[PDB]
Symmetry: D3
Subunit: 253 residues, 6 copies
């Protein structure tokens, strides 16, 4: 067996990938989402009630389908990053990255020694298919994709420095955390917030990195795609489930 | 503590209750459904991957909300009925009921001896809140609601007989099983099927029982409500999740 | 490795075994109970929310401790009996046994062919420790203990016939189901019910079988032990947890 | 999406498929087995501690790999068969089938009405991918494969009658159950048993059905393959795990 | 829907709340505790085997009852605090708080930016009921209650400083950790320890904060209530389960 | 009850203990491993998908058998160490220890105050059997065994300083991590690496500490045992499961 190709990573330079947030925290729900045809699914370990074992179940469900899995850990925790890579998550989205130094540590956390600090345990890892991928320790690093979130003032204050870090494949803008940080909590649609988001997208792409974002607003999402934003999540399973059930009930009250 | 009042059961005689099918087989998904404001939630033990323990988790989730829980067991199995009643399911929907004799056995399965055959284990039961409901063994039978599905030719062949069974509170028409039984598998909307469903609804109400049905078709659901159908499910969580994610992706392909 | 000796089965003829009902349906709770020093623990698959997998977890927890595990299936279901024997339950308590014919089928359900109908799958079974007990298929039958519950009028109407069945090691009286069957639901303490229980215990022991019973009433439990009742459960974990927490709160209201 | 093609079913007529028993009852263990390259994996619901939910997890694990899943229910229970088909098991192995009448009921249990009695619930089923397989109710029956076990004297007494049942795709011989039934429990290797197995394989293939068998004995497995046996399981994960760990320890004692 | 009112938080100023420690780490056990009528339940993420997902199940169980849930995380970890707030824990008890700077960080960890560092993910959170609480991002901070444990010498060395932190609603004294820190491990009842606890309670109340404590000792608990201690836990479910089963067995040995 | 004697800890000074890596992350798989007769089983919380709750299940499985449990946390995290000790893990293997200061903190993390910083919660702990071990707070420290991994250049740069830390019972060499650190990733067999391992084992034993190592290579494992290495793991369950199933398939292709 050859290592699983990270098509999400390759497509960062060839197309615009449409994403779905997966926070139902469940193998069975993850599989329903996997049947739709999204370019990528974000398994949310930060804002959905997930742990390593529930993320593994969802990776196993999604693996039969073409949708590419991206995992968001709760934080940029080196040992948690090790755990998520070994269950075979090939793309990670690190929340609240605020310096070149933190971004550099996240790069190393995804690469084997001697160049990185990823803990070595290939005999035990779904990532290596328990060494059924015979050359995994040689081919692993190339199919790993690192995304970092800029979603705070300090993040924006260190944007040019983060964009200079080799091994950061993409910067993803978090409008909820960023609008809150800017004193517009719950109102990311405000012009003050949107002008910073557009400028930020433009700066990311000018430094040769992939830009990403989440908006459940169809107009905002289409605007980001027109700017050339490489990875755009367009909704959230929890939100779509709630809204679809409320919209149906309102037809009958 | 006084026994939980079965408002679903009381409302069978006073209003038309709007229902949502719950097949996501998950305590967390069940809570999302419970927040919407449906009159009733059908926790599907027949066609979703549920067991007693997953049904228990969903009852615990829904219990904090006004939505009334109805549980469908995989079949009219007396021991399984016993199990679902003790975890505190107060309304049961029995699939594929086909004679007065089977409906009578389902009535007895829901009532304590000496009048019924419900196994007695109140010290262990969430149903009694582990005897924190001090008179549960006296007050239980009153708050239990039995619904039976007519969804086969034999069922329609025994409809008058089933409708004469004291203890059957409601008959629910299953259009998927019934359309298939009639040789119109996948096409319940056909006039042949619909005329039999309308006639069946009319006969159920004429015998003083509650009539129920599921249709994801808004026009068919509104027609059944106009006929006075007492319990009408209008959608399915798995269906709404899939459709909502597909509809969103189609805006971006 | 030699097959696990069924000390519960042996002690039926040498002493009076004190039992604790286990309906918290949980490996961790089962282990707390296992630390107390009961002669036997009844893992309740009839009135607690248990399935094969949760009973297995509790068997694994209890196995490190001297307390002997007894499992009650939801019903006298031959395939469920097969499943519970293979995860390594060596003593079963069958509810609602009402004839010599049903008791004879329960005997066969616990024994390998050609004499019985227990399904053969020793390579897969914790019971054989996955064939690490090298002669399991030869030594299994001898360490299996069958108990049947008499707890209905029909049971009492067939008591002499059930007591004549070879391979029934014990008859256990269920006061909750029996008092309900006799039209004294919730009032097993009534003289009418108690005189039948005492006579029943006396008849069981006169036929050379072990008698068993559950009472949370200390006086009734001590009376049953004075009659020579071989296996007496004296409480229920759910009941003791609820009562201990209520009794503590009442000191502070 | 088109219905998942049952390659196991097709290959019954074109090749000899090498099988592995999966009794570790675990999504993660099922995936390790799926990486090896077995033609088919038997998820054992009869002699491993599995339920609908654990079988679902294992189907989800295995689905990303070419190995075809076969599921053995605990018995020929029509409602359990309905549950396993809806979670998306396309090939079932029914234990202890002993008459043409039982084999006919198993055929019907696997097919939609009006021809069969499979309960209809495509909107909820992983089988239909929640109706993302748009014509599932029309294409389902074709990709379902029914196997029945002959592993008792009464089975052998009804072999010709079972082999005349249209809809039985294969007969699988269970040497553990069959050797016990014949009074050679634990000794299937005996000439008395082996002559009956060989004759039975010959009869199965002469009636135009696929023959199958399990043997962990390499010599017996190769002999069965030389006779033309269509589906041959050659080992059991629990057995291989135990034996590999025992053999390694013995090198160091 | 309006945000869930934190009655625990309001009652810190109006009454003395009686608490029960919940360490059975189980949705079902948590519901049993919820039925008793305790003012508050401490779901222990520090000293019982809990994770985010097991704490979620226990919150869902307890939510149908008046008892207010308080969650103790394993440590004052900002990302874990974020996770427990989003699953909807409205009161946190932070162990081993030892400086004003740590207490200030715990205040910020519980509040949204720009004033705090709580991660924003309301679309995914049970806390917001998945935005069914429409103004959650405006009303959240008000219903969050922060408690900190003083249970070390350094904690006592920084008590005046911690008590001057705005946003700390309560200080909880941990007698096990504090007695151990003072060189009286296992003997909190010693006058040396008790004099420091009473003095500490008095200082907490003098600074206008709520004081709290756990003691399974009825006399010590009543003494702490007589001093005006605002939140007093009086027992532990694991302890009461073990003691109740031991006391019962001793009546029969 | 007296505290569970740590025989692994005692045998570090009296014999050479043969070990098996347990990375199947499963109570049921842990029990199969426990039946074989390994001196010690390493429950891998660093490179297998385990959390506190899955490690608890595996401790409960293994507890009925003589094999001694050793638990590897994902990192040297003081609060996680507290959690694993309270569920009753008596021997910990800390990964990637790189200084005397880190090794000292790990010693303190394993001992109660006042000498250590282990959080005190005996009433809730499987470790104390919920205080059924009456003197646990006095006898705990004695039966706890601390092992640290040297598996990086900085570890080797601090070997003499680590080996002078009182409370470090053993140093375990990780050849996967160490060979990667040395620029020989996937090739621990190289003379450059092996000479450093041998020298390292010699230094460990010369400082009076127990030396340990993992090798699936029988020749390397026997060489390490000939050098006097006190604890030698000789294989990995995931690796043995995969290899056994691959070797069997190859006989039939
Ligand atoms: O040798 C090492 O570094 C270890 O500590 C552990 C083990 O997980 C190996 O990585 C297996 O591949
Ligand atoms: O051979 C048989 O009878 C089988 O059907 C199955 C298998 O479970 C064996 O019993 C393994 O011991
Ligand atoms: Ca289950
Ligand atoms: Ca978990
Ligand atoms: Zn964010
Ligand atoms: Zn139906
Ligand atoms: Zn009973
Ligand atoms: Zn068989
Ligand atoms: Zn404490
Ligand atoms: Zn290592």
């Amino acid at each position: 067996m050859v290592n699983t190709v990270n098509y999400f990573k390759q497509k960062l330079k060839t197309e615009q990938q449409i994403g779905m947030w997966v926070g139902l925290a469940d193998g069975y729900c993850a599989e329903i989402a996997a049947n739709v045809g999204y370019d990528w699914l974000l398994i949310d370990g930060e804002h959905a009630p997930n742990d390593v074992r529930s993320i593994l179940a969802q990776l196993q469900s999604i693996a039969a389908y073409p949708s590419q899995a991206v995992v968001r850990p709760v934080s940029g925790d080196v040992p948690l990053i090790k755990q998520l890579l070994d269950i075979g998550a090939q793309t990670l989205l690190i929340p609240m990255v605020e310096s070149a130094e933190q971004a550099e540590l996240m790069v190393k956390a995804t690469r084997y020694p001697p160049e990185g600090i990823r803990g070595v345990g290939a005999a035990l890892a779904r990532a290596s298919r328990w060494n059924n991928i015979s050359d995994y320790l040689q081919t692993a690093d190339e199919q790993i994709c690192l995304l970092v979130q800029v979603e705070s003032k300090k993040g924006l204050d260190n944007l040019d420095e983060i964009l200079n870090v080799d091994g950061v494949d993409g910067i993803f803008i978090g409008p909820a955390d960023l609008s809150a940080a800017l004193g517009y909590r719950g109102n990311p649609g405000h012009e003050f917030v949107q002008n910073i988001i557009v400028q930020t997208i433009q700066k990311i792409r000018a430094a040769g990195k992939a830009a990403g974002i989440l908006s459940a607003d169809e107009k905002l999402a289409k605007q980001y795609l027109e700017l050339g934003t490489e990875f755009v999540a367009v909704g959230v399973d929890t939100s779509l489930l709630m809204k679809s059930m409320k919209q149906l009930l309102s037809k009958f009250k």
